[PDB]
Paper text:
The genome of S. pneumoniae contains genes that encode a suite of proteins that are biochemically capable of performing the various concerted steps needed to completely depolymerize and transport all classes of N-glycans found on host glycoconjugates. Here we characterize SpGH92 (TIGR4 locus tag SP_2145) as an α-mannosidase that trims the terminal α-(1,2)-linked mannose residues on high-mannose glycans to generate a substrate for EndoD. We also identify a solute binding protein (SBP; NgtS) from an ABC transporter (ABCNG) that binds soluble N-glycans and, through X-ray crystallography, reveal the molecular basis of its interaction with these branched glycans. The identification of an ABC transporter that possesses an SBP, NgtS, that is specific to the recognition of N-glycan fragments suggests that this is likely the convergence point of the complex and high mannose N-glycan processing sides of the N-glycan degradation pathway, with this transporter functioning to import soluble N-glycan fragments into the bacterium.
The final refined model contained four SpGH92 molecules in the asymmetric unit with each monomer comprising two domains: an N-terminal β-sandwich domain and a larger C-terminal (α/α)6 barrel domain, which is a conserved and widespread fold adopted by other GHs from families 8, 15, 37, 48, 63, 65, and 125. Each monomer binds a single metal atom, which on the basis of B-factor analysis after refinement, and coordination geometry, was modeled as a Ca2+ atom. This atom is bound in a relatively deep cavity present at the centre of the (α/α)6 barrel where electron density consistent with a single mannose residue, resulting from the hydrolysis of the α-(1,2)-mannobiose the crystal was soaked in, and a glycerol molecule was also observed. The glycerol molecule was coordinated by the Ca2+ atom as well as additional direct and water mediated hydrogen bonds. The mannose residue packs against the face of the Trp70 sidechain in a classic pyranose ring-aromatic amino acid side chain interaction; additional direct hydrogen bonds are made between amino acid side chains in the active site and the O4 and O3 hydroxyls of the mannose. Furthermore, the mannose present in the SpGH92 complex overlaps with the mannose residue in the +1 subsite of Bt3990 while the glycerol bound in the SpGH92 active site approximates the positions of carbons 2, 3, and 4 in the mannose residue present in the -1 subsite of Bt3990. Bt3990 also possesses a +1 subsite that is responsible for binding the mannose residue of the leaving group. This subsite, which comprises Trp88, Glu585, and His584, provides the α-(1–2) mannose specificity in this enzyme; the architecture of this subsite is completely conserved in SpGH92 with the trio of analogous residues being Trp70, Glu541, and His540.
Numbering used by the authors:
A (entry chain B): 2 to 87, 88A, 89 to 694
B (entry chain D): 2 to 87, 88A, 89 to 387, 400 to 694
Write the structure that this text describes.
């Protein structure tokens, strides 16, 4: 059985607003596809519209939802029914299905509707899908179509529909129109509207249908149609997946279960989503939603760079460099359309944060020589974005004036500590890119500004705390207090948010020993939290509090790098134990998969890096900290060198939580430099029962 | 570890409107208690307010909800919080909790609120509960109170509150008022209202609190308070449970897992719920909701007799005869208050069905000599209580009435119950008239198709028929199941279908068919359809009452050995010792009793006939206390292999039997089944 068929897209999909096990969806699609496909369980639960445990479905939803917090857009629900019987609404047409016989694979979705006795099969392409419908008793099929957008349907010929649907983007309120073409191999006997939805009656009890969408035009949607039969489309999708999955090759698992790792590989290649199309002459084009006009060039959607810069993109840099460059070209195209580097695309700008963490991808690209052709423009785009004011109020740095004046955002701004620290990291990214381009004045100014994390450190308590305009800390402080000054965490986590200058953070805290004790205390504390900053409990609090990892809130991005900070401490062996145990206890090969929000490849990439044995602690520095690998023998394709790295784990016992030694080829290492990594053939960890350093 | 502590009240509690795994709640209570206690997960999901998988809770709900279809009434949510912080609504006060460390036992509920660092413990009494709250950091406690009813709070002294809450009953719209007394061992610093709820501030970071309710009066609520400390109340609740659970004693499980059976025992003793109280002079009193005045005598709520007559009550008759009589006295008291024998009590009449299946309990009591002192009054109540015009005129309900086939068949059974009770009281004219009427199931049989079908006023069947069609003429099933709803005259049903062979083929076809259904009668899919359709049992829809007896019908067929295989495999495949426990709605002891009977090896196919059909038992050696004879029956299963699906022979003491008569059962010491690999008959 090939790997792709063993991956279950339902991992992470059991969630509610109050508690996340991944907040993923069972996305069927090609890697980075423009549309994904998922069954819809309910439309009464807002963004939480799929439940893998409930054997009910309402149809297949063509979706663009990247998270339940962002929600969906330009989505379309397709519901096969028998022409006879049925019901008078979407809800009253819902059907039980056979969960055990359903297939939930990345490239293949199969469901059997027990009410209608219809077998539905779907396989994706980038811009569309091939779908087979079969009423097993030979009764005629009909198809319902529903959207939250205003949906219009025209019959073009005996076997072809053209759909148009319209809504608005959530934050910019730009008009957003998606066109869809559907073509069947059986005649369409009638179309009509029923209570806002469309009902298409078909001549046969069986049909194969081609579907495709476009954000360009109706004729582009037709062009985007699959040209091949179901099996051929399915094989192509399999090949598209396999091309990327096979950049990792597990030679020997040892004691480890590979199931979770495999699932993470699937999650790694879903985002960002393609948001450009190819015209008749073979050129990339995209809709500029600010003007409603077509512009040349690649473009992508569905990514919050604050999530993905820290784990996902660095991993892309190792294994899919062409894709990596294409993504950066797309983000540069966003800049060319709007004047600003984007923050959270879905499909246009949705970011409410002031921080611009795409800079972390830009700086990382620079330090690893990924996109030399774009380096100049990207730098200029960062600089523009960091200094320019937006008359429309949406983009660039907020409180720039105050930040420039004071060296920090004050309590005039919400979540001022978290955002000040994000700015300080961005400043480092600009400084590094300036330096590499030999712009000395800019490098010097931004390097100095990147030290602004110092402005908020309260040496009396030992934590980062917020200041008012006059520069005073607020008198009532608790390190367990969440929100207000800190985004989805407390001072305990937020204080360690200085990726770009860990040595300086150490000096700032009073030196290596005090820093060491800070880390230990975070690991040893109970997962206490206070709701003061919010006035209610949010899922991120609940996820930490119900877990046995102290204040290491692995459920959310701010704690991702914390275990690796022991590498800079008096106890460098503690990183391995923390990682081995987190990996074993926090992640499960089941529908209740993750410790928190997966966040578009962010958390899966965290897991994968854990398995490789090293981690890009500070994107923008060409360096990796050591953790502890998972498998006896795993190969990873270092695509930039067109060669395999063999990663070996010796004495790989489950009760050995420490690394005795690590050799890059023949050389003993405690940190790995990117250049050395790329020159290496072998990476060999030897484990031990007790610490040896 | 005692049995009671191994029972997890969450079995059956994972559900949604569209799909049931029991539709139970994690009820903490004493057996047949007046109030039960459950954590509340959400108030945005209607009746589906608890989810065992979600580590969130909004407080402890004092509930009277017997099913999500009926909903709740006279309920009260109690929410411990820290006096500092908190939030501005019930929703914004919800807290995560530690699911793994929580206890969900019948007599003991423990949850740790992680947001407030408060450990809550509750143990029930019949009329109240003892509660311990402990803020583990020594921060002061407050307590919120919420209800859908209009809720009023008065502070009686430093440590005592008197609560009053009012609503109306769902169908009759009778006024419904519950009083609650709360007493703490720490001072109440303040009470106030916030956005419709009450906030009680307490002096300490921990307290033990006594709670009790009444439907009589505020002073009766105070009288109902627990008089003892937490441990003592907990021991008493344990003893109350053990007294009933120990009527079954598993000596040797063999290959079988006992976990599900044990859970079913817990479910057996929850309903009906006590709905009467004891005055200062020791007499039973109840609120008559039709008048708003107090009346003497026991009274019970939360039971739909259409569910419970067929399995639960017959089982009660064997093991808890005093309780059995008390329940019947309560139902007679309902008749005395309203003029009608009740159908679905929650807490007053909710039944939409025309059928009066409490007659099945009355007739069964008669045939087993359970309540000789009530026999005359019960008979009179049945006759009084006994649509009607047309039924009397035509011998059936026509399509003028919804679900006419199901209801006609229910009436025919009720007529048999009256006829049997008449005969036993030597009222010959009534016995004769109702015996004849009990044959009315024949009026709807269509010999062309072989199914029961509906008729219009003129007596015609509707021309377009499908046996897979659900609703309209049939309640929550198709003609395939509904046609077999003639408990009281199986031999006649057989003759009516064309004889033993044709009947046999009917049964086989039901077992062999795909679980196809058509939504025609509803216009949408309902959970009962979904449960059948997703299961591998053909048209044997074990998820719902109409199919419960179908496997046992093979006992009357050319293939009497097939019953055992159907039961053994249903029992193994349809029930799971987990939160996703049941194939369908548990229905207040109805489905659990079905399971328990399966385990004993015999079944009360027709309540009102003093007779049990044979199935196939579960354990190597199980004892059951036949309380009427004050002795144990030892049930043995020989060659009890999991791949042996048939009964080679069954001996009641020394006598070979194929059906068991109640009288013989009560005289017996031993019941011995020997299993076989292949059929032997
Ligand atoms: O209100 C804070 C919330 O913000 C949402 O957009 C998401 O980030 C949630 O994960 C988080 O709980
Ligand atoms: O309308 C049918 C529905 O009616 C409710 O009262 C319950 O009996 C459900 O089990 C059922 O699905
Ligand atoms: Ca997150
Ligand atoms: Ca039922």
């Amino acid at each position: 059985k090939p790997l792709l068929e063993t991956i279950d897209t339902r991992f992470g999909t059991t969630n509610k607003h109050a508690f996340s096990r991944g907040n993923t969806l069972p996305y069927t699609g090609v890697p980075f596809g423009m549309n994904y496909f998922v069954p819809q369980t309910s439309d009464q639960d807002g963004s939480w519209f799929f439940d893998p445990h409930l054997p009910i479905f309402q149809g297949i939803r063509l979706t663009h939802q990247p998270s339940p917090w962002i929600g969906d857009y330009s989505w379309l629900l397709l519901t096969p029914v028998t022409s006879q019987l049925g019901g008078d609404s979407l809800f009253h047409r819902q059907s039980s299905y056979d969960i055990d016989k359903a297939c939930f694979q990345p490239h293949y979705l199969k469901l059997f509707s027990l009410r209608y006795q219809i077998e539905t099969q779907l396989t994706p392409t980038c811009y569309g899908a091939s779908i087979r419908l079969n009423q097993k008793q030979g009764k005629a099929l009909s198809l319902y179509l529903h959207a939250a957008d205003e949906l219009t349907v025209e019959q073009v010929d005996k076997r072809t529909l053209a759909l148009r649907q319209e809504g608005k983007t959530e934050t910019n309120k730009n008009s957003l129109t998606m066109f869809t073409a559907l073509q069947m191999n059986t005649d369409i006997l009638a179309i009509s509207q029923e209570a806002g939805d469309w009902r298409i009656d078909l001549a046969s009890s069986q049909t194969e249908m081609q579907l495709a969408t476009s954000f360009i035009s109706p004729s582009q949607a037709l062009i985007n149609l699959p040209q091949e039969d179901f099996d051929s489309c399915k094989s192509s999708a399999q090949v598209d997946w396999e091309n990327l999955l096979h950049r990792f090759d597990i030679i020997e698992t040892g004691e480890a279960d590979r199931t979770f790792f495999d699932h993470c590989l699937y999650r790694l290649f879903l985002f960002p989503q393609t948001f450009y199309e190819i015209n008749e002459s073979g050129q990339a084009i995209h809709m500029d939603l600010a003007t409603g006009t077509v512009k040349p060039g690649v473009l992508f959607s569905n990514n919050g760079f604050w999530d993905t810069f820290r784990t996902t993109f660095p991993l892309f840099a190792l294994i899919i460099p062409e894709h990596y460059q294409r993504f950066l070209e797309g983000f540069l195209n966003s800049y060319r359309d709007t004047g600003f580097l984007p923050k959270w695309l879905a499909p246009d700008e949705r970011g409410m944060m002031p921080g611009t963490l795409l800079d972390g991808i830009i700086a990382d690209s620079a330090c690893k020589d990924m996109t030399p052709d774009l380096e100049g423009e990207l730098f200029q785009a960062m600089l523009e974005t960091a200094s320019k004011a937006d008359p429309l109020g949406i983009n660039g740095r907020h409180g720039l004036a105050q930040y420039q004046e004071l060296g920090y955002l004050s309590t005039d701004h919400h979540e001022s500590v978290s955002h000040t620290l994000d700015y300080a990291y961005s400043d480092f990214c600009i400084a590094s890119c300036a330096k590499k381009l030999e712009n000395i004045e800019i490098a010097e100014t931004y390097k100095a500004a990147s030290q602004n994390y110092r402005q908020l450190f309260d040496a009396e308590t030992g934590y980062m705390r917020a200041r008012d305009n006059q520069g005073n800390f607020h008198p009532d402080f608790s390190p367990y207090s969440w929100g207000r000054d800190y985004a989805e965490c407390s001072a305990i986590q937020a204080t360690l948010g200085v990726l770009h200058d860990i040595p300086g953070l150490i000096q700032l805290m009073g030196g290596k020993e005090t820093f060491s004790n800070y880390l230990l205390k975070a690991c040893q504390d109970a997962p206490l939290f206070e709701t003061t900053g919010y006035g209610y409990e949010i899922h991120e609090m609940s996820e930490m509090a119900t877990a046995p990892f102290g204040q290491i809130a692995i459920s959310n991005q701010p704690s991702f790098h914390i275990p690796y900070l022991f590498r800079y401490s008096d106890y460098p062996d503690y990183t391995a134990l923390l990682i081995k145990t987190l990996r074993q206890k926090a992640f499960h090969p089941s529908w209740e998969a993750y410790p928190g929000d997966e966040d578009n490849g962010s958390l899966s990439a965290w897991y994968i890096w854990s398995a490789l044995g090293f981690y890009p602690t500070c994107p923008g520095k060409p360096s990796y900290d050591l953790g502890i690998p998972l498998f006896d023998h795993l190969r990873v394709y270092l695509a930039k060198e067109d060669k395999w790295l063999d990663i070996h784990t010796k004495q790989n016992h489950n009760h050995f939580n420490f690394v005795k030694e690590c050799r890059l080829d023949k050389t003993l290492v405690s940190t790995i430099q990117h250049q050395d990594l790329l020159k290496a053939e072998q990476l060999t960890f030897t484990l031990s029962w007790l610490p040896s350093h």
